[PDB]
Structure formats: C-alpha cells, structure tokens
Design a protein around this nucleic acid. Structure first.
Lengths: 192, 126, 49, 23, 182
RNA sequence: CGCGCGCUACACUGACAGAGCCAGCGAGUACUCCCUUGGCCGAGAGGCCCGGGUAAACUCUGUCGUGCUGAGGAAUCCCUAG
C-alpha cells in the first residue's frame, strides 16, 4: 500500500462509486437516452470540479450521479450545500442495495429512463420531447418527488429518494415521477 | 545528493506544497497521514491518483504535503493536484522518461485538473 | 461633546445634544475639534439618543 | 395600544419640518 | 489582629444588616502598593467546569474543557453568557490560568469575580485596595472571624513588606448596604 | 396615511451534546458601551475596590421524536457561470 484503507485496497481493481459499485456491467434501456445518460467515463464520488455550463450539451457528458447530486441541491436542500447532497446519494444508494440487492446505479439509470417523458404539450400542440430534456425532466421529477414526499414526514430524503428511485426503476403506479410522466403523456394524447 | 522534488498544487486560494523524495510508501499531509486529512466524504478524491496509478508506482517514494488557505474542498483539490504532479515530476527526473509519459497519459485520460489547474475568470458577454 | 466611537474620518460623538430633534436642527453644522480639526454634523445616530 | 404610531408619525413629521428648515 | 475586634466588627456587621441572605464581604486597603510585578498571589486562599492544558485534557475526561476548546465557548458571547450560569465553579491550570482572562474576560472575569483557582480567590487589580468574599450569612462570627484571620495572615504574606502596618485600612464589608469598620 | 427597500420571526434541512477540521482582506503612542447603590484613600477637587442593570459553515459520532414548540393571494419585477 502507499497509504490506503482496507476497504479501498480491498476494492482497488476497477472503478467503484462510493468504493462499492462498479460501472462495468450496467446498461441503458433506451437507445434514444443512451448517448446522454453518462456511464462512459468512470468517476468515484459525484463531487467533481467540471464546468458543465460553458456551452450547451456538456451536461450530456457529465456523469449522471453528479446530475442527481446537482439536482439534489435545490431550494429543498439550500442551494450551496454539495456534501449534503452526495451524503444523501450515499445513504440512498445503501438503502437501495439493502431493499433491493440489485446494483443501485442500475436502479437509478433504469429509473431515469423509465421516468423521462417522451411527448409533451406545447401550451393545444403536442410535441415529441428531446432526449436531453428527457434526462433533465427525469432527474428533476425524481428529486422533486423525493422532497415533496419527504417534506413533513420522519422519512429522510435518503429513504424517500431511494423509494422514488426504486419504484421509478420498476415503473410502478406509486412513484411521483412515473405519475408525472403518465400525466404529461396523457395530456399530449388528449390534445395532439 | 538526494533524490528530491518540490511540487505545487492550486485551487481558488488553497495552495499546497508537496516534496517527493526516495522513500518507502508514506504520504503525510501536514504531518498527519494522507488517509486522515480532508473529512471523510472527500478522501476518495484524495485517493484518485493513487488508485489510478497503482500503489506499485508509489511504494518507493515519500510525499510530504503542506496545505494552506482556502476551504476544505479547495484544500482537497490542491492536495490531489500536488500528489499527481509530485509523482509525474519524480518520474520525470529520476526514473526513465517513458514512465513519465505513461503516467501523464493515465492522469490526463482521467482528468486534466490533476495536472493543470484552470482558474476561472469571468465572462463579460458581447 | 466627547468622541464616543472613533472610525477613521467619521466619529460618533456624544454628551452634546439631548435628542435627535436637536441633531436634526444642527444637521449640517460646522463642528470643531480643539486640535484645529474641522468637521460636519452628518446624521443623528438612532439608538444612543 | 395605537398611540405609539401617532408618536412616530408626529416625531418623523417634526423631523421633516426641522430638516427642511435646516437645509 | 485582635479577635475581639474581629468578633465585635462581625457582630456590628450583623447588627448593621437588618430588614435571600446574601454573602458578606471582607476588604483590605493597603498602602504604598506599587504591585506591578506578580508579587500578589493570583490564586486560592482557604458543578465545576475545569479548564485544563494539553492531553491531560483527554486523559482527564464537571466539564473539563481544554485550553484550546475554551476559546470557542467563550468567544461565542451567546455561549459566554451560558457557562456563567450552568457551571458553578471554574478552576484552571498554568497556561489556562494565564490565558483565560483574554478569552472569557468580558462575561466571566468582570462582574461575578468567578475566575479560576490555581493548578499545575485573590486578585491584584494593582491599585492599593483589594477585597475578597467573606462567606455565608448563616455563618457564625467566630467562623468568619477565624476565616478572616487566616485569610488576613496569608494575604499579608502575599503583601509581606510590612504585614502589620501596610494596611491603611482593613475592614469588614456588607454586600449591598453601607459597609462596616474593623 | 400610502408605496416600497433592508432586517427580524416562522422546522426536518430539527433540537441537544461531544470529537475533528478549514479563509482572505485587516497595524496612526490608537481603540475603551452604559450610568450608578456602596466602601477606601480623600482639609477640598479626583484616582481606586466591590455589586446593579484565530470564522460561520462543514464532517463524524451519540440522546429526544412533528410536539401554535407551519414559508406568505392576485399580481408585477429581476436573473444565464464562480
């Protein structure tokens, strides 16, 4: 060792996020959303010093766990606080792996694919939705569901983020972001 | 007549020196070891050059880091920049030149902010 | 009156006027320090009446 | 009660008279 | 230092005090006191938040706060008004004693005279007058008389240069009313 | 009285308690928040002594568990990388 703990030396081989979960066997389930949801470059914790607002379509190259963090610092998490958001991502992924025994990052990526809407309503006209907007609206409805259901209850944003991300990965009729996808698509069907 | 390399690292205001000499594997940051600095949730970002480059590249050197200024985050980026530049610089001057270029390739294929710090100016749009 | 707090060029001074009404009556006045140092009454400080 | 508001409007009005006379 | 004058002055103080029962005081007004050195004893005579030094802090552990961690609790003026009521007594070692009044010197070392006692009270205030707390109010005049005797002898040993005629006055004191003679 | 603007107050992102760990501008023999019940030394004027009124944050670890202990209508306004 140079100086490294037993957990890190224990998993020193590939790249693991939160030193537990590799990227090397996770898969998109939308060829539309594949080139934007980033599993290509490997990153260890979501905290990184990347400028993904220099010009458009950089945030289709930043990693999506950093996008779930960055969306988790909104007004319900008091915008300056970053390490609060990667801590909620940590406890949420642990609650996913203990509730699920599946790879929690695959739970999150299939959650995002299963949550972003494909048709919306131009405010009436009904248009197809961009895939970058599909990723953005996906992540925003996920964290919005996490806060709006973890608002007054004892259940923390860790637990509720993990429940919306698991049920979002299932595509169930329980999850807030699934319900908003079906409501927006329902309005686009009714209007056209 | 020793094998000594001085190296800096930067962020917003955190500046860090690191001296890398012929040693036996230790990295000590302000006296305390590297696995003890920078409160727990960012030590993966401390370790990122180590488990890119492999500890076998580090089992012959000693890295001594002093960090001043900035907040916690900027001290972390200053440390990891000083680690990466320290080993690239030691392998520049003492072991062969091929291994430098291989280490620069590994660090640059990961993230160039481990070597070149790009401080932000502002954008007065036209 | 007596300098109460001393900043660089301003100074809160005291023990001279009794009320903010009196300050407002003299709120542009040429005040002077016996070092030969001129000055101007600017505005009534609120809580130390 | 609602006499302090009368004290503040009369006080600030008297300050307006004294400052206009002063300037 | 006659005990007839001590018990007579204590009985005249208890008779001067009339209508809880607050603590009596004792006063020593010395003369020719250029006390600019450390010639006065900055320590003791006769629920604790024990201030302390380095890792006999952690080897030690009322609340044994260290000489580093005291600066936050007293630098916070909201918390400097907290420890003055919750902790009953204070006691410091060498470096904590020599660095306490520059940190807690506003909310602690000014009014209540609740400063520490020495480890590994009497305070100078280097003009010629000094004072100290006497004791209880249900206490006896012989008890406070003997306490005033031993405290007068030890304090005169801290002001040894005459020890009998250095005091231009040496009197008892009522707490809040007009004080008394001796 | 009216229109605002700054500031305070209002909870899960709680409260309590420890442990740990970080800035940059800041140096004119200059700077004190009160006003006092008392007492000393005071012929007299004052100086004394004693009472009344180098960061926040952040990290980590432990105790309680939504408990008047509830974030602001219409509107109109601003804002695109440190």
């Amino acid at each position: 060792y140079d100086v490294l703990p037993k957990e890190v030396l224990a998993e020193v081989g590939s790249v693991k996020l939160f030193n537990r979960w590799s990227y090397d066997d996770i898969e998109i389930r939308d060829i539309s959303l594949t080139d934007y949801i980033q599993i290509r470059a490997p990153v260890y914790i979501p905290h990184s010093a990347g400028r993904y607002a220099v010009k458009r379509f950089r945030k289709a190259n930043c990693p999506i766990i950093e996008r779930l963090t960055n969306s988790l610092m909104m007004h319900g998490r008091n915008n300056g606080k970053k390490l609060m958001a990667v801590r909620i991502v940590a406890h949420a992924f642990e609650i996913i792996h203990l509730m699920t025994d599946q790879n929690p990052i695959q739970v999150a990526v299939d959650a995002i694919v299963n949550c972003g809407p494909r048709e919306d309503s131009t405010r009436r006209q009904a248009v197809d939705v961009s895939p970058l907007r599909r990723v953005n609206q996906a992540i925003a409805l996920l964290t919005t569901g996490a806060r709006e259901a973890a608002f007054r209850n004892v259940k923390t944003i860790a637990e509720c983020l993990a429940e919306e991300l698991i049920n979002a990965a299932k595509g169930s009729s329980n999850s807030y972001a699934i319900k908003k996808k079906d409501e927006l698509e329902r309005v686009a069907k009714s209007n056209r | 007549s020793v094998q000594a390399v001085q190296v800096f690292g930067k962020k917003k205001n955190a500046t860090a020196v690191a001296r890398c000499v012929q040693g036996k594997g230790l990295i000590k940051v302000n006296g305390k070891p590297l696995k003890l600095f920078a409160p727990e949730i960012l030590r993966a970002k401390l370790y990122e050059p180590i488990l890119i480059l492999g500890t076998d590249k580090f089992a012959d050197v000693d890295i001594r880091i002093r960090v001043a200024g900035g907040g916690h985050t900027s001290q972390v980026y200053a440390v990891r920049q000083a680690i990466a530049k320290s080993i690239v610089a030691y392998y520049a001057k003492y072991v062969d030149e091929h291994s430098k270029n291989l280490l620069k390739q590994e660090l640059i294929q990961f993230d160039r902010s481990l070597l070149v710090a790009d401080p932000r100016r502002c954008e007065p749009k036209k | 009156g007596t300098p109460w707090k001393i900043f660089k060029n301003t100074a809160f001074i005291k023990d001279m006027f009794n009320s903010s009404l009196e300050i407002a009556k003299f709120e542009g006045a040429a005040i002077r320090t016996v070092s030969g140092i001129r000055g101007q009454i600017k505005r009534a400080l609120s809580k130390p009446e | 009660a609602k006499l302090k508001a009368e004290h503040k409007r009369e006080r600030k009005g008297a300050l307006r008279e004294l400052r206009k006379d002063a300037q | 230092v006659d005990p007839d004058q001590t018990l007579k002055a204590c009985k005249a103080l208890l008779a001067h005090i009339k209508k809880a029962e607050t603590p009596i005081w004792l006063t020593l007004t010395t003369k020719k006191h250029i006390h600019d050195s450390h010639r006065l004893q900055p320590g003791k005579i006769i629920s604790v938040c024990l201030i302390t030094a380095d890792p006999q802090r952690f080897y030690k552990n009322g609340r044994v706060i260290d000489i580093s961690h005291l600066k936050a609790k007293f630098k916070a003026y909201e918390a400097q008004r907290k420890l003055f009521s919750e902790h009953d007594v204070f006691l410091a070692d060498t470096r904590i004693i020599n660095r306490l009044p520059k940190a807690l010197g506003k909310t602690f070392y000014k009014t209540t005279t609740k400063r520490p006692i020495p480890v590994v009270l009497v305070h100078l205030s280097p003009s010629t007058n000094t004072a100290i707390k006497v004791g209880y109010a249900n206490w006896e005049p012989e008890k406070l008389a003997a306490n005033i005797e031993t405290v007068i002898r030890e304090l005169v040993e801290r002001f040894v240069p005459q020890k009998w005629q250095n005091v231009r006055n040496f009197y008892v004191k009522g707490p809040e009313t007009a004080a008394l003679p001796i």
